[PDB]
Nucleic acid binder design. Structure first.
Lengths: 351, 351
RNA sequence: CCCCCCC
RNA sequence: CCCCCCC
RNA sequence: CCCCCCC
C-alpha cells in the first residue's frame, strides 16, 4: 500500500508556478507618483492633513502613498507596479502656485485641506501664546510616517472585514499613536483609516507598493521612532490571512492529546503537505494574503475539517481564540479539545 | 515465478508518449481573439452582460474567453491554441461605431446586449436617487472575472453531465458569488452557465486556453478578490474526472481492513502501477480529463473491479460518496466495506 | 472559494 | 508597536 | 470506452 500516494497540493503549486505566460491587467489605467525631489513638500501635505479637522478625508491614503513614492523614487515605484503583475502607467506629479498637482487627486481637495490647516494654525497662534513646540507643527518630518502608521494599522486588517478593520484601527491607534495624538489633538483616525482601506481595496497593486516600503524601511540602518513603529506594525501584519497555520503550530507546541485521534492522524499527512508548501514558497509566503496573491488559498487548511476543529478547540481553551469568527466543522472535537486545553492551562506543572 | 511479469500500463503509456507524428485537427477553422489594447473596452462588455436581464445569452462564454485573450495577449493565445494540438487560426478583433466586432459573434447580439444594459441603466438612474456605488456599475474591473467565475464553476463540472453541471453551478454560485449577486441583482447564472458549457463542449481547445488563464492568474503576485476566487475554483477543478484515485488514497488513509482481502491484494499490483503512471506524468496529470486529453483513460481504475468496489464502499461508509453515480462492480465487498467504514466513523478512538 | 481574534 | 535598572 | 458527489 506504499505506492497508493497522490501528492495533489505539490502538483497544484507546480502547475501554478511553472507558467510561461504573464497575466495582463489594468492596461488602460494610470496612477500618480511623486519624485523624491518633492519630498520636503509632500511631508508638509502629509502633516497638513493631521492637525486640522477636515470635512473630507477622501485622498489621505493617496497622500501617504505619495510619500512612499518619494521615499522609494518614481522609477522604483513604476518598476514595482510593473513587476506586481499590473501594467498601470505612473503619471508624475507637478507643482503650481506652492502646492502639488497630484494625478487623480482634485486640486480643490488639496486646496481645501491646506486652507483648513492654515486657518487652524492661525487660530492656534492668535489665541495661544505663540509657543508652538518643534513637534506640533505640520512641517514635522515624522508626520508622513504617522499617516502611513494609520495606513499600516488598517493594513494589518485587510484579511478581516471593513467594520472590524476600522474598529481595530481606532482602538489600536488610540494607544499605539498616543504620542502623535498628544502632539496633534485633532486627528481623525476613523476617516483616515476609511480612506486607506478604500485605497487598498480599489488599487491592489498599492499593497505591493506598501509592502516594498516596509522592506525599504526595515532594511535601513537608522530611523526615527515613527519609522520604527511603522516597521513594528508592518511585521505584525506578516502572517495575515493565515492564522490557522499559526494556531496549528501553537497546538503542536501545546502537545494536545487529541492530535492523536484517528481522523486527525488521517489528515496530518496533507496538513504536513501544506506546511511543506509553506516552506517551499519560503519568506514571501506570509505576504500572500496581504498582496491578495491568487496563489494564496493553496495554504488553506479548509480541506482538513477535523484538524481545523481540533486546532480551533485548542486555541479556544488557551484563550487565544478571542472572538475569532471562523467556522468549526466538527463540534465534538472542538469541545473536547477546548476542555483539554483549559485543563492544561489551569494546571501548573514544572519540570 | 518472479519472471512472469508483464507491465502493460507502462507499455501503453510508452507507446502513447513516444510518437514522432503530430495530429492535425480543425485545419480549416478559425476563432476570435481580442488584443490587450482593447481590454478596457472588453471589460465593459463583460460587465454589460451582468446587470441587465437579456433574452439571449448565447455568446457570453465567448466574451469571457475574449477577456482571457486580452489578459494573455493575442500572440500567446494563438501559440497556446497551436500547441494544444489544434490548428485553429486566430482572427483578430476590430472596433466600429464605440463597440467591438468579434469574429463569430453577430453584431446584432452585441448591440442588443448593449442596448438592453443602457436601458436598464437609464431606468435605475431615473427612478433611483442617482447614488450608484463604485462596485455596481458595469465598468467595474472585476466584472470580467465574475463572468469567468461562472465559467469556472461550470468548468469544474465538465466531467459530469450537463444537467448536473448546471444545477451545481447555480447552487454554488448563489453562495460563492453572493457579493456579485448583491452588486448585480439581475444576473442569470443558469443561462451564462449554459453558454459556457456549450463553448467548452464545442471548442475543446478553449479548455486549454482556459487552463492557461488559471496558470497565468495563479502565478501573479497580486490580484483582486474576484481573481483569487477564480483561482480557488480553478484549483478545485484540478482532480476532475479522477475522483476514483482520490477516494482510493482516502481509503488507504482510512486503513480499511478489506484492503487485505485476496482479490484486492491481487489487483493492488496494477493499482500501484496506475498510481506510478500518475507520478510519471506528474503535475499535468490532473488536467488530463479537464482538457479531454485522449491520454486520459490510462488512469482509469475500471480494470480493477474489486478494488473499485472496496474504495466506493469505504467512501459510502465515510459519507464522502454523497450522490455519486458510478458503478459498483462487486456488491458484496461494497456493502461490507461500507459497513466497516460506518463502524470506524462512529467509534471515536484517540491515540 | 478563501479570510475573519489580540498586540 | 518596541524600549525602560546599575556601572 | 471513460467520467459521474460536496466545497
Amino acid at each position: 500500500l506504499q505506492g497508493i500516494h497522490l501528492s495533489d497540493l505539490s502538483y497544484k503549486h507546480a502547475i501554478l508556478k511553472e507558467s510561461q505566460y504573464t497575466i495582463k491587467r489594468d492596461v488602460g489605467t494610470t496612477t500618480a507618483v511623486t519624485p523624491s525631489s518633492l519630498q520636503q513638500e509632500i511631508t508638509l501635505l502629509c502633516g497638513e492633513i493631521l492637525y486640522a479637522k477636515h470635512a473630507d478625508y477622501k485622498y489621505a491614503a493617496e497622500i501617504g502613498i505619495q510619500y512612499i513614492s518619494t521615499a522609494l523614487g518614481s522609477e522604483r515605484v513604476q518598476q514595482i507596479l510593473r513587476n506586481s503583475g499590473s501594467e498601470v502607467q505612473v503619471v508624475l506629479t507637478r507643482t503650481y502656485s506652492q502646492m502639488l498637482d497630484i494625478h487623480g487627486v482634485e486640486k480643490s481637495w488639496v486646496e481645501e485641506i491646506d486652507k483648513e490647516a492654515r486657518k487652524t494654525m492661525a487660530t492656534l497662534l492668535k489665541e495661544s501664546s505663540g509657543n508652538i513646540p518643534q513637534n506640533q507643527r505640520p512641517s514635522a518630518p515624522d508626520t508622513p510616517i504617522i499617516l502611513l502608521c494609520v495606513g499600516a494599522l488598517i493594513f494589518t486588517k485587510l484579511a478581516s472585514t471593513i467594520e472590524v478593520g476600522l474598529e481595530t484601527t481606532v482602538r489600536r491607534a488610540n494607544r499605539v499613536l498616543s504620542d502623535a495624538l498628544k502632539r496633534y489633538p485633532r486627528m481623525d483616525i476613523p476617516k483616515i483609516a476609511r480612506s486607506f482601506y478604500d485605497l487598498f481595496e480599489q488599487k491592489v497593486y498599492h499593497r505591493s507598493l506598501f509592502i516594498e516600503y516596509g522592506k525599504a524601511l526595515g532594511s535601513s540602518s537608522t530611523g526615527s521612532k515613527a519609522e520604527s513603529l511603522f516597521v513594528n506594525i508592518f511585521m505584525q501584519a506578516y502572517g495575515a490571512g493565515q492564522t490557522m497555520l499559526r494556531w496549528g503550530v501553537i497546538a503542536r507546541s501545546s502537545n494536545n492529546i487529541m492530535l492523536g485521534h484517528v481522523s486527525v492522524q488521517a489528515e496530518l499527512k496533507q496538513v504536513t503537505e501544506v506546511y511543506d508548501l509553506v516552506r517551499e514558497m519560503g519568506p514571501e509566503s506570509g505576504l500572500l494574503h496581504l498582496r491578495q496573491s491568487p496563489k494564496a488559498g493553496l495554504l488553506s487548511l479548509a480541506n482538513c475539517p477535523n484538524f481545523a476543529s481540533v486546532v480551533l478547540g485548542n486555541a479556544s481553551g488557551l484563550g487565544i481564540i478571542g472572538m475569532y469568527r471562523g467556522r468549526v466543522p466538527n463540534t465534538e472535537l472542538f469541545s473536547a479539545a477546548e476542555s483539554y486545553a483549559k485543563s492544561l492551562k489551569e494546571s501548573n506543572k514544572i519540570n
